[PDB]
Amino acid sequence: KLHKEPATLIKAIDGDTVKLMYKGQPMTFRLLLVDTPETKHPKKGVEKYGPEASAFTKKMIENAKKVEVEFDKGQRTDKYGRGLAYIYADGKMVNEALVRQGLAKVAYVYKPNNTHEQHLRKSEAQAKKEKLNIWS
């Protein structure tokens, strides 16, 4: 049973990456299971819908009353030291929101960190069906 824990927004870095204060420590968090267009893409640069995905994540978290992080059942940090989690803004999962709006694709999934994979895949099929943003 996954558990939500509170966190505080420090800074939004990109559509899929945010800096949070978690248990008294500043930490970078990578949103689990989603890939957004990048503004800080190592190789390309500024990709289409990158600025949009990135403003969406920022506004969604900045305007929330309550931010919570939810770790999955596997590793909780990646090789870059980033926390790996589902992020909630007033009860709503940012990761699903991005996918539902066609501003993210469902990433390649590594068990065992794949607990919400089916839900997100269903949100992605709808955005596709609706031909939103990335899908238009």
84-109 core/surface letters (b: 16 or more CB in 10 A; e: else): bbbbbbeeebbbbbbbbbbbbbbbee
Residue 14 annotated as part of some ligand binding site: no
Per the annotation, the verdict on 62 as an active-site residue is no
- Can you give the resolution of this entry in Å? 1.9
Are 86 and 105 in contact, with CB atoms under 8 Å apart?
A: no
Q: Which two tokens stand for residue 16?
A: 């899929």
CA angle, 85 then 14 then 110, to 5°: 35
Are 18 and 12 in contact, with CB atoms under 8 Å apart?
A: yes
Q: Which residues contact 79 (CB under 8 A, 6 or more apart)?
A: none
At CB < 8 A and 24+ separation, what contacts does 28-31 make?
28/80, 28/81, 28/82, 28/83, 29/69, 29/82, 29/83, 29/84, 29/85, 29/87, 30/78, 30/80, 30/82, 30/83, 30/84, 30/85, 31/57, 31/85, 31/86, 31/87, 31/94, 31/95, 31/98
Rounded Cα distance between 114 and 33, Å, is 7
Are 6 and 64 in contact, with CB atoms under 8 Å apart?
A: no
- Count of domains forming the chain: 1
Helix (H) or strand (E) holding 106: strand 105-106
Per the annotation, the verdict on 82 as an active-site residue is yes
Experimentally, the structure was elucidated by: X-ray
Q: Which residues contact 18 (CB under 8 A, 6 or more apart)?
A: 9, 10, 11, 12, 28, 29, 31, 57, 61, 87
- Residue 96 structural domain: 1-136
Is the sign of the CA dihedral 16, 26, 112, 119 positive or negative? negative
Residue count of the chain: 136
Residue 17 annotated as part of some ligand binding site: no
CATH code for the domain of 15 = 2.40.50.90
Catalytic residue among 5, 38, 96, 117: 38
Residue 51: CB atoms within 10 A of its CB come to: 14
